[PDB]
């Protein structure tokens, strides 16, 4: 039948592949071994997944009620997309922009859309790494700074802000962030954040100074360190106070939450971050090896290890959460017992955890109208366990105090923050490789122009544009950017990739070329997933997100000391002009298709 | 042992006198600049 719709004689031909594979032409980077490539892909995936994104959503939507839809959507969608991304590379032998421009060169818009999305993600990232390394610097001391409040100028009592709230919230919101009451209001450059951000950008640029040839070495410990630390956290996080207390809470589902589809809305987005899809990324990783590699085995092992790591991090996070909740419940019960004992002057050792209600009843029966002066508070497990933190508080606020309660706090603090830094660094490597590569691929750079110069220029430009996050309103801007970055651009990019593969080029020619390249023709599962399962299932969730974009409210918690009920969340909606900002991400991808069509129609004649 | 009207007030700590975070940042940045210098020297040594 020859199902070629007039797109051949311009793509790198199959005979061209035979000619290039038998003489190993130079002037192209190549991995030293399949392990150095397996490991860097693994590190990129785990870095994009398990920092600030997966545990936060896991503990925000309830846990368990989010893990199940995430797992099913991952096993249904990520594996086909990952296999397709890994096999479209290693065949056209080019970067993402080059790969997507080789076939049907009319649009070429998805490549630049992925470029812009990766640039934005790296822009809002590497500020998380700056905060992580700043929290790491203040370690290496027995009296950890967030463990105690600072004394006021009176030298008698604590500061009002540090007294109405916890010391950890004060050390985060005030000592480190120096957050502002308002959103538009700004402040100084906050030189601590400038120094930390400069250090982060410098270490990133040094690590990938010459690109792949360095990063392959750099990941050798960077993509493996957050696997030997995390495991030991388990052996500490289980058998201290919350063994089968938070884990049991995670294991039991929540039927009520699954009824609300909002969780599903995020779950799909998570896999896009979990498998590092919709970016340039793995394509440049994929089209750097020989033409005799088994892509299916690579995809399956990557997916299996990703799922295992997700289960691991969920277990550890909920273990720590359960331990903290148990400690808070115990201290509240002790406070209640102390209040009763002081009220009625009973012997100290007479009332306990279990004989509290009967003694309380006896006390009110004995001497009524004097017990009524006592203010009793109620505390029960599943009220502290259901409490969810917003923003980036999961660690900076929860894990920090949980560590302080532990015996040898500085050691686990420093190792935890080192893990987090390594995960963030692997992530940043991954979305950094998807930058500059399109820039050097579109081929307008002057000839000599060594790659180090371009990497330095792009790093300094990104530093200059990310200067904004070091202000006093940086946290609000980062939250605003994250509220719209990701999701819709990634969904659009996935739809464009799926459409281009299924309609342009062709599934049949794909089967022929994968059979010739390594053999092992894909079985019916892959064909049915690419045919109607994955594209329709992603399109329906895209439409659902578009529908619910109209009804979710738009606000954010703020830190205003000058306001009643201060240790509570305040919502003040959004300014009238900030909406304009999100428009910059509205219609990026499909701008160039009509332009190219107009050029073709009016340029020939 | 509380006296219900007399509370302690003299508890001022002064443990860190030098802000250890600054020295940690300084040594980290020194190592970073040393590494970037040797890396660029090796890269330009491609004679
Ligand atoms: C299971 O999930 C539901 C989904 O929200 C939880 O519901 C929230 O419970 C709190 C306290 O009872 C209320 O303030 C909210 O109104 C509830 N959400 C809804 C649907 O409005 C429920 O508590 C969870 N139970 C668990 C953790 O097992
Ligand atoms: C302690 O004693 C008070 C009495 O003030 C209890 O309250 C009253 O209980 C009767 C039921 O017989 C109710 O009709 C009243 O409305 C209650 N309030 C009053 C009279 O002010 C109270 O319940 C006891 N405290 C506890 C353990 O709740
Ligand atoms: C850093 C900004 C948001 N905060 C978080 O993501 C913290 O949650 C995590 C993430 C990874 C790992 Br491993 C653990 C143990 C916890
Ligand atoms: C930073 O925090 C201090 C108090 O710790 C405060 O006086 C200062 O005003 C804050 N910086 C700015 C620009 O407001
Ligand atoms: C503890 O409570 C019981 C019953 O109220 C009573 O004997 C007394 O208040 C306490 N027991 C002793 C031995 O003091």
UniProtKB/Swiss-Prot annotation, chain A:
Belongs to the sodium:neurotransmitter symporter (SNF) (TC 2.A.22) family. SLC6A19 subfamily. InterPro entries: Na/ntran_symport, Neutral_aa_SLC6, SNS_sf. Changing residue 497 to K: In HND; no amino acid transport activity when expressed alone or coexpressed with CLTRN or ACE2; loss of surface expression when expressed alone or coexpressed with CLTRN or ACE2. The modification Phosphoserine is found at residue 13. GO terms for biological process: amino acid transport; neutral amino acid transport; response to nutrient; sodium ion transmembrane transport; viral life cycle. Glycans are attached at residues 154, 178, 254, 350, 364. Changing residue 62 to R: In HND; abolishes amino acid transport activity. This is Sodium-dependent neutral amino acid transporter B(0)AT1. Changing residue 575 to L: In HND; no amino acid transport activity when expressed alone or coexpressed with CLTRN or ACE2; loss of surface expression when expressed alone or coexpressed with CLTRN or ACE2. Transporter that mediates resorption of neutral amino acids across the apical membrane of renal and intestinal epithelial cells. This uptake is sodium-dependent and chloride-independent. Requires CLTRN in kidney or ACE2 in intestine for cell surface expression and amino acid transporter activity. It is linked to Hartnup disorder: Autosomal recessive abnormality of renal and gastrointestinal neutral amino acid transport noted for its clinical variability. First described in 1956, HND is characterized by increases in the urinary and intestinal excretion of neutral amino acids. Individuals with typical Hartnup aminoaciduria may be asymptomatic, some develop a photosensitive pellagra-like rash, attacks of cerebellar ataxia and other neurological or psychiatric features. Hyperglycinuria: A condition characterized by excess of glycine in the urine. In some cases it is associated with renal colic and renal oxalate stones. The keyword Transport applies. Robust expression in kidney and small intestine, with minimal expression in pancreas. Also expressed in stomach, liver, duodenum, ileocecum, colon and prostate. Not detected in testis, whole brain, cerebellum, fetal liver, spleen, skeletal muscle, uterus, heart or lung. The chain crosses the membrane at residues 38-58, 64-84, 117-137, 189-209, 218-238, 265-285, 301-321, 410-430, 453-473, 487-507, 528-548, 578-598. It comes from Homo sapiens. Residues 1-37, 85-116, 210-217, 286-300, 431-452, 508-527 are cytoplasmic. It catalyses: L-alanine(in) + Na(+)(in) = L-alanine(out) + Na(+)(out); L-cysteine(in) + Na(+)(in) = L-cysteine(out) + Na(+)(out); L-glutamine(in) + Na(+)(in) = L-glutamine(out) + Na(+)(out); glycine(in) + Na(+)(in) = glycine(out) + Na(+)(out).
UniProtKB/Swiss-Prot annotation, chain B:
It is found in: Cell membrane; Cytoplasm; Cell projection, Cilium; Apical cell membrane. It comes from the Eukaryota. An engeneered stable, dimeric and secreted receptor with combined mutations that increase the affinity for human coronavirus SARS-CoV-2 spike protein shows potent SARS-CoV and SARS-CoV-2 neutralization in vitro. Belongs to the peptidase M2 family. The extracellular region of the ACE2 enzyme is composed of two domains. The first is a zinc metallopeptidase domain (residues 19-611). The second domain is located at the C-terminus (residues 612-740) and is 48% identical to human collectrin. The cytoplasmic tail contains several linear motifs such as LIR, PDZ-binding, PTB and endocytic sorting signal motifs that would allow interaction with proteins that mediate endocytic trafficking and autophagy. Homodimer. Interacts with the catalytically active form of TMPRSS2. Interacts with SLC6A19; this interaction is essential for expression and function of SLC6A19 in intestine. Interacts with ITGA5:ITGB1. Interacts (via PDZ-binding motif) with NHERF1 (via PDZ domains); the interaction may enhance ACE2 membrane residence. (Microbial infection) Interacts with SARS coronavirus/SARS-CoV spike protein. Essential counter-regulatory carboxypeptidase of the renin-angiotensin hormone system that is a critical regulator of blood volume, systemic vascular resistance, and thus cardiovascular homeostasis. Converts angiotensin I to angiotensin 1-9, a nine-amino acid peptide with anti-hypertrophic effects in cardiomyocytes, and angiotensin II to angiotensin 1-7, which then acts as a beneficial vasodilator and anti-proliferation agent, counterbalancing the actions of the vasoconstrictor angiotensin II. (Microbial infection) Acts as a receptor for human coronaviruses SARS-CoV and SARS-CoV-2, as well as human coronavirus NL63/HCoV-NL63. This is Angiotensin-converting enzyme 2.
């Amino acid at each position: 039948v020859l199902p070629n719709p007039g797109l051949d004689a311009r793509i790198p031909s199959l005979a061209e592949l035979e000619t290039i594979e038998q003489e190993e032409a130079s002037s192209r980077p190549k991995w030293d071994n399949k392990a150095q490539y397996m490991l860097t892909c693994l590190g990129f995936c785990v870095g994009l997944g398990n920092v600030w994104r997966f545990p936060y959503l896991c503990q925000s939507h309830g846990g368990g009620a989010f893990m199940i839809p995430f797992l099913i959507l991952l096993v249904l969608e990520g594996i086909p997309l990952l296999y397709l991304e890994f096999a479209i590379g290693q065949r056209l032998r080019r970067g993402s922009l080059g790969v997507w421009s080789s076939i049907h060169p009319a649009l070429k818009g998805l490549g630049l859309a992925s470029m812009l999305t990766s640039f934005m993600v790296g822009l809002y990232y590497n500020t998380i790494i700056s905060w992580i390394m700043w929290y790491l610097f203040n370690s290496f001391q027995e009296p950890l700074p967030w463990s105690d409040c600072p004394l006021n100028e009176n030298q008698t009592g604590y500061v009002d802000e540090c007294a109405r709230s916890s010391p950890v919230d004060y050390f985060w919101y005030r000592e480190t962030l120096n957050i502002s009451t308002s959103i538009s209001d700004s402040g100084s450059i906050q030189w601590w954040m400038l120094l930390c951000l400069a250090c982060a950008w410098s270490v990133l640029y040094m690590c990938t100074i010459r690109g792949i040839e360095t990063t392959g070495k750099a990941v050798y410990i960077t993509s493996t360190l957050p696997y030997v630390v995390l495991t030991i956290f388990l052996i500490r996080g289980l058998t201290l106070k919350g063994a089968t207390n938070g884990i049991v809470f995670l294991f039991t589902p929540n039927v009520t939450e699954l009824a609300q589809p909002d969780t599903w809305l995020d779950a799909g987005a998570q896999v896009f971050f979990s498998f590092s899809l919709a970016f340039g990324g793995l394509i440049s990783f994929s089209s750097y090896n020989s033409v005799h590699n088994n892509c299916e085995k690579d995809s399956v092992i990557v997916s299996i290890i990703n799922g295992f790591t997700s289960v691991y991090v969920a277990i550890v996070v909920y273990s720590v959460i359960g331990f903290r909740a148990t400690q808070r419940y115990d201290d509240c019960f002790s406070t209640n017992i102390l209040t009763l004992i002081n009220g009625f002057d009973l012997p100290e050792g007479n009332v306990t955890q279990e004989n509290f209600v009967d003694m309380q009843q006896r006390c009110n029966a004995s001497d009524p109208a004097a017990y009524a002066q006592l203010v009793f508070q109620t505390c029960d497990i599943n009220a502290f366990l259901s409490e969810a933190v917003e923003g980036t508080g999961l660690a900076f606020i929860v894990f920090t105090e949980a560590i302080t309660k532990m015996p040898l706090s500085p050691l686990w603090s420093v190792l935890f923050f080192i893990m987090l830094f390594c995960l963030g660094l692997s992530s940043m490597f991954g979305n950094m490789e998807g930058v500059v590569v399109p820039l050097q691929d579109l081929r307008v750079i002057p000839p000599k122009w060594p790659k180090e110069v371009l990497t330095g220029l792009i790093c300094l430009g990104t530093f200059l544009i990310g200067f904004i996050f070091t202000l006093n309103s940086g946290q609000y801007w980062l939250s605003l950017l994250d509220s719209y970055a990701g999701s819709i651009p990634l969904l659009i990019i996935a739809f464009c990739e799926m459409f281009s593969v299924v309609y342009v080029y062709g599934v049949d020619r794909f089967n022929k070329d994968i059979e010739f390249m390594i053999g092992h023709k894909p079985n019916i599962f892959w064909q049915v997933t690419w045919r109607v399962v994955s594209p329709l299932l992603m399109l329906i969730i895209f439409l659902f997100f578009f529908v619910v974009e109209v009804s979710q409210e738009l606000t954010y918690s703020i830190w205003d000391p000058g306001y009643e009920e201060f240790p509570k969340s305040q919502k003040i909606s959004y300014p009238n002009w900030v909406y304009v900002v999100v428009v910059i991400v509205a219609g990026v991808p499909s701008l160039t298709i009509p332009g190219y069509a107009i050029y073709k129609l009016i340029r020939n004649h | 042992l509380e006296f219900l009207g007399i509370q302690p007030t003299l508890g001022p700590p002064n443990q860190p006198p030098v802000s250890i975070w600054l020295i940690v940042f300084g040594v980290v940045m020194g190592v970073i600049v040393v590494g970037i210098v040797i890396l660029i020297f090796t890269g330009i040594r491609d004679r």
